[PDB]
Ligand binder design. Structure first.
Ligand SMILES: COc1nc2sc(C(=O)NC3CC3)c(N)c2c(C)c1Cl
Ligand SMILES: C[N+](C)(C)CC#CCOC1=NOCC1
Lengths: 225, 235, 339, 267, 56
């Protein structure tokens, strides 16, 4: 049997257990989003909208729902060394600048920024750690894209494009070319918004998509899905 | 810094009631178990009550059982002892003692200053400190002996005996915890050596601040019992 | 063509090192230990199961006493456990929940942690106030901090994803020494028993031996086909073992300056996450992505046994200083004590 | 005695399936959830039905009469009707838990503890117990005499119309219409406002609802018609109805456990 | 990149010029260490249940 100090140590251990269980429950009730995208693709604009070295973390609460958002852009190491840490996030918010559809990369000659963002989206969406994780896709800078789409056609990026040079058709084509990179259509859903800078309609879209993801997770928990 | 301040003493009519308070500052109060320990003026220390961290475990001494109620309020960092139907024997100086319990911890490490309470008018382990007084001179090694009626060595290899020093006019100070381990801030000249039921506390190269009364305490079983104390004085 | 001439001189030096390594390799390790008896079959049972972590466990380190261990999980919590009684001695909340390594000081007074925040946090355990406080935050790495080990209470050596190792003075928070030379992310380190030398394995399929005082790379070891996730020293200090992503472990020797043994089996293709040795060095234990741990005869390269008790990836493992037990921590949020 | 062999095999499938569900929840750490406690309780009730309730009805149909006794008959009836109502109540609170999870995904799992799961399981078992057990054990005392024949083993108050309709409405018709309304609202709520998911969950909803209807309905409709006319229903029909109620407990893992792919692997 | 090239060349010089012993000697020394501490390894040979803290 135990001595007095052993019994008090067991009682301290059980108090630690109860504090751990409470902290675990409060951590479980929060929403965690992983923010990804190419450099200078509008990620900062998204962070400023949501807000109102190392891993940047953003705390914001919308409609009595708490959101942590993790920006990992300052990690210069290769992605597969640390991406497995984000296996259990609620969603991946992926930012793509539309205005980069005609701008060549400055680091590498004769390589396009839009092809690089599609290859990054293909690497993330089909990663073995994110089989069930959903993607909220934000297409930034749609007014600069509408200004550029009048003078520069989409055919310089997508030579197989068969539509016109108008805004909406080209935007729908870029949306379809990002959503058809999803190999795992059944296990994950991709939500797309055009990042309109009016009446805070982006935080509401994130809220709606996270609510849909939580509904699907509850359906998987209850055995119905 | 760590500080425990007691209040609520004074002169009480016999059979009355009073409530002692101990305000804590400078440490994480809600992670420490707390004890009330009394000290009748002629006599030595006597354990009164204990409330655990989180208030899940409460123990009392037989003398005070049914009359006294220990409690803690953790947001205000305060410890209460509600004493009902006081007797003449209850007249003593009362200390709140903090004690934390994990592997390698040092319980009974800090004692409050104490508040004075004046009242006008079988299976417990018995610790024996046979020699009450020892005359000593500075620079001379000295041994203090304690003897327990029961074996204090547990089956986990720990021996639960503690050595405290009470300097004249001050609160008791923890010197040795769990037979041989020495405490934080205690000089290395103190040393505890015991073999199950006989314990020795050695003070090599005695200094002027080593005089006072030395108490041995067991912590194997509740109620915690103290020795009668061995006094060291100069010349 | 100064650049090309130094490339030819570098290739000539590499050829000279390769020839000098083949000169001093008369026999193999298998040819010498062909006459010693095999260790038999090692059956280790799960004595204790430490429960409490609510996310994946990324690291664990044993204390010198061998009764206290620290574990780190991604829920933001370092737990300090008592192996013998399965009691939680401490629970430390982390400011950043993205932790990848933890260390226990040899004195027992401090723990360390670090990860994707590029900061090694040093926590004081023996505080007068009774809680665990952040004693130091060491910043200066520009990549994720992958491993840290205490030398004493005042010095610590960290490895990071910025292809550099660093020796820090804790009480002034300054990088005393910076170790450079690795071209890929340094994934693990290990300290010698005298703490004069340390080895580090990086994502460039190479391991470098570094002097701690003079701050230089003494020897470079190649042979692995992919990223060296784990590294550990043999108990004498004259050899180390590397665990990599090519499903092989390799035993290198500092005095012979080359690879001595390869530990691989055709049935196991998963990469190694953690390696350690027994107290005598006869057994080499390796954790794998196949949810199991393999015990290898370090002198004969036979699989001495299997530790199979985890439902997810065995992320970390350690052996006590007396060699009494092996702790394996895994992504299934449990640690298990094996004996 | 071929019927005894087939019904013994059915009992064996029921017991092993319930044991497999319990093993799946206990052995595997990743399945110890608040949602799976209700499945645990349901598989324990179905284990009770398969182990004890089925066997006594087997010897009853093979012999053709009940020679066990009159006290053991009342204990069997009380045990079977309380465990069966507990099974129906566990299904009803599974419907309520799923409804609240889908309709309020952001607030309901925050206020759903293990204490509320235990409270609703306890409330379901206590409500089934006080609905069935006192009326069946004490009905002969309340009227002072036992009018049930010694040979046959059935409930005395099944001939009284008022108590028959009250028990049928409370035990089955009200929970089945609450389950139908709640599961229909689960199907509608599942649709992505922001589909393969909707059609898949609509299939699983229709599967479990059709299973519950086609098993539990013929017994209740025989209960309702028997009270007015004793002579109408032969004992053969009665056996077929009882066996359908039993096979519901048999195929409870088939409809609930298999849909969740973790249990399919763990089997 | 002449600075990095000449630093890599000096690194390979200072790694080439070290003294190396023969593989057979180092293998014999690892075997001698493994047999010198055989009885001190609890993993190699199981301790008694009373001696084992975790078993007891
Ligand atoms: C005439 O009234 C009744 N007779 C019977 S006979 C029977 C049965 O199972 N008989 C077959 C197995 C042998 C019943 N369950 C039953 C009931 C409920 C009534 Cl009310
Ligand atoms: C006992 N049996 C399984 C044959 C039917 C029953 C019962 C009690 O529970 C409910 N009453 O009627 C439907 C469910």
């Amino acid at each position: 049997t135990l001595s007095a100090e052993d019994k008090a140590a067991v009682e301290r251990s059980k108090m630690i257990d109860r504090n751990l269980r409470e902290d675990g429950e409060k951590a479980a009730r929060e929403v965690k989003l992983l923010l990804l995208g190419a450099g200078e693709s509008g990620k900062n604009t998204i962070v400023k909208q949501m807000k109102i070295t190392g891993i940047v973390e953003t705390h914001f609460t919308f409609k009595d729902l708490h959101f942590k958002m993790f920006d990992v852009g300052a990690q210069r190491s290769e992605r597969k060394k640390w991406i497995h840490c984000f296996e259990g996030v609620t969603a991946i918010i992926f930012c793509v600048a539309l205005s980069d559809y005609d701008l060549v990369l400055a680091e590498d000659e004769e390589m396009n920024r839009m092809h690089a963002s599609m290859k990054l989206f293909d690497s993330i969406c089909n990663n073995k750690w994110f089989t069930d994780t959903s993607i909220i896709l934000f297409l930034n800078k749609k007014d600069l894209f509408e200004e550029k789409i009048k003078k520069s056609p989409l055919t310089i990026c997508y030579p197989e494009y068969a539509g016109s040079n108008t805004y909406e058709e080209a935007a729908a084509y870029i949306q379809c070319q990002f959503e058809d990179l999803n190999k795992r259509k059944d296990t994950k859903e991709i939500y797309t918004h055009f990042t309109c800078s009016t009446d805070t309609k982006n935080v509401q879209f994130v809220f709606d998509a996270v609510t849909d993801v939580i509904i699907k997770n509850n359906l998987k928990d209850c055995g119905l899905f | 810094d760590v500080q425990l301040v007691e209040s609520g003493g004074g002169l009480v009519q016999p059979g009355g009631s009073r409530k002692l308070s101990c305000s804590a500052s400078g440490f994480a109060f809600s992670s420490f178990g707390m004890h009330w320990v009394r000290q009748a003026p002629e006599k030595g220390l006597e354990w009164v009550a204990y409330i655990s961290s989180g208030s899940g475990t409460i123990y009392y001494a037989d003398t005070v059982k049914g009359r006294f109620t220990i409690s803690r309020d953790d947001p205000k960092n305060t410890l209460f002892l509600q004493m009902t139907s006081l007797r003449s024997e209850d007249t003593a100086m009362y200390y709140c003692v903090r004690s934390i319990y994990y592997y390698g911890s040092s319980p009974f490490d800090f004692w409050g200053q104490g508040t004075t309470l004046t009242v006008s008018s079988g299976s417990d382990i018995v610790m024996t400190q046979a020699t009450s007084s020892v005359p000593v001179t500075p620079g001379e090694s000295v041994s203090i002996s304690c003897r327990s009626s029961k074996s204090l060595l547990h089956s986990n290899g720990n021996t639960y005996l503690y050595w405290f020093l009470q300097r004249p006019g001050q609160s008791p100070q923890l010197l040795i915890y769990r037979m041989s381990n020495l405490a934080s801030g205690v000089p290395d000249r103190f040393s505890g050596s015991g073999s199950g039921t006989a314990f020795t506390l050695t003070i090599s190269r005695l200094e002027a601040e080593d005089v006072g009364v030395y108490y041995c305490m067991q912590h194997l079983e509740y109620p915690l019992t103290f020795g009668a104390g061995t006094k060291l004085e100069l010349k | 063509s100064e650049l090309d001439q130094l490339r030819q001189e570098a290739e000539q030096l590499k050829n000279q090192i390769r020839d000098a390594r083949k000169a001093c390799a008369d026999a193999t390790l298998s040819q010498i230990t062909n006459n010693i008896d095999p260790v038999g079959r090692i059956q280790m049972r799960t004595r204790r199961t430490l429960r409490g972590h609510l996310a994946k466990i990324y690291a664990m380190h044993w204390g010198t006493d061998s009764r206290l261990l620290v574990s780190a999980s991604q829920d933001g919590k370092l737990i300090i456990w008592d192996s013998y009684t399965t009691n939680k001695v401490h629970a430390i909340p982390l400011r950043s929940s993205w932790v990848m390594t933890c260390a226990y000081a040899p004195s027992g007074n401090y723990v360390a942690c670090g990860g994707l925040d590029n900061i090694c946090s040093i926590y004081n355990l023996k505080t007068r106030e009774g809680n665990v406080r952040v004693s130091r935050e060491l910043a200066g790495h520009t990549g994720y901090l992958s491993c840290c080990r205490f030398l004493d209470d005042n010095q610590i050596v960290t490895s990071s994803g910025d292809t550099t190792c660093a020796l820090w003075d804790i009480e002034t928070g300054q990088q005393t020494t910076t170790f450079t030379g690795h071209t890929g992310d340094v994934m693990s380190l290990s300290l010698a028993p005298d703490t004069r030398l340390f080895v580090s394995g990086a994502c460039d399929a190479s391991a470098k031996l570094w002097d701690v005082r003079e701050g230089m790379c003494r020897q470079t070891f190649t042979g692995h086909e992919s990223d060296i996730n784990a590294i550990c020293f043999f108990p004498n200090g004259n050899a180390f073992a590397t665990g990599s992503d090519d499903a092989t472990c390799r035993l290198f020797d500092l005095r012979a300056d080359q690879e001595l043994m390869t530990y691989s089996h055709d049935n196991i293709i998963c990469g190694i996450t953690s390696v350690s040795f027994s107290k005598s060095g006869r057994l080499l234990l390796a954790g794998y992505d196949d949810f199991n741990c393999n015990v290898w005869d370090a002198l004969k390269a036979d699989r001495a046994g299997v530790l199979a008790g985890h439902d997810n990836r065995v992320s970390c493992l350690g052996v006590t200083d007396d060699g009494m037990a092996v702790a394996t921590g895994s992504w299934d949020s449990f640690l298990k004590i094996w004996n | 005695v071929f019927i005894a062999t087939v019904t013994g095999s059915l009992s064996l499938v029921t017991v092993v399936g319930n044991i497999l569900v319990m093993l799946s929840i206990k052995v595997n750490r990743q399945l110890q959830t608040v949602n799976n406690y209700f499945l645990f309780s349901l598989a324990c009730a179905d284990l009770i039905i398969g182990a004890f309730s089925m066997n006594l009805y087997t010897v009853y149909i093979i012999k053709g009469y009940w020679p066990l006794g009159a006290v053991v008959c009342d204990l069997w009836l009380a045990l079977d009707y309380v465990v069966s109502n507990a099974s129906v109540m566990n299904l009803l609170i599974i419907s309520f838990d799923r409804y609240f999870c889908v309709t309020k995904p952001l607030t309901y799992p925050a206020r759903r503890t293990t204490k509320m799961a235990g409270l609703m399981i306890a409330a379901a078992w206590v409500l089934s117990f006080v609905l069935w057990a006192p009326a069946i054990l004490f009905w002969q005392f309340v009227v002072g005499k036992r009018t049930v024949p010694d040979n046959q083993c059935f409930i005395q108050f099944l001939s009284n119309p008022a108590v028959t309709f009250g028990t049928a409405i409370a035990a089955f018709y009200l929970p089945v219409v609450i389950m139908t309304v709640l599961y229909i609202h689960i199907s509608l709520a599942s649709r992505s406002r922001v589909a393969a998911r909707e059609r898949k969950v609509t299939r699983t909803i229709f599967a479990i609802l059709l299973a519950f209807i086609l098993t539990w309905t013929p017994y209740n409709v025989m209960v309702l018609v028997n009270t007015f006319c004793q002579s109408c229903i032969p004992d053969t029909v009665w056996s077929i109805g009882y066996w359908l109620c039993y096979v519901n407990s048999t195929i409870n893992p088939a409809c609930y456990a298999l849909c969740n792919a973790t249990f399919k692997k763990t089997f | 990149s002449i600075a990095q090239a000449r630093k890599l060349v000096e690194q390979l010089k200072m790694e080439a010029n070290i003294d190396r012993i023969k593989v057979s000697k180092a293998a014999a020394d690892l075997m001698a260490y493994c047999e010198a501490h055989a009885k001190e390894d609890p993993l190699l040979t199981p301790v008694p249940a009373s001696e084992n803290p975790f078993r007891e």
